[PDB]
């Protein structure tokens, strides 16, 4: 059941992906560490909540 994932390697040694391994020891999900494998979304629902889609090169009001 070992989970193997990639590290985003910043400072490299004068020394090819580097991985790390994870095993969950407990039955309850709450006990698990944070994966940090998170997703990003586009800000539109906050930045552009208007009904008619805006074209940035066109006049906002027409």
């Amino acid at each position: 059941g070992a989970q193997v994932s990639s590290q985003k390697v910043g400072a490299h040694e004068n020394s090819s992906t580097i991985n790390y391994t994870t095993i969950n020891y407990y039955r309850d999900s709450a006990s698990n560490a944070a994966s940090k494998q998170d997703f990003s979304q586009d800000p539109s629902k906050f930045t552009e909540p208007i009904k008619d889609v805006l074209i940035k090169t066109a006049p906002m009001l027409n």
């Binding site: 059941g1 070992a2 989970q3 193997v4 994932s5 990639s6 494998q37």
Partner: peptide, 5 residues
């Protein structure tokens, strides 16, 4: 076994 990612 190993679940890779």
């Amino acid at each position: 076994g190993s679940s890779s990612t």
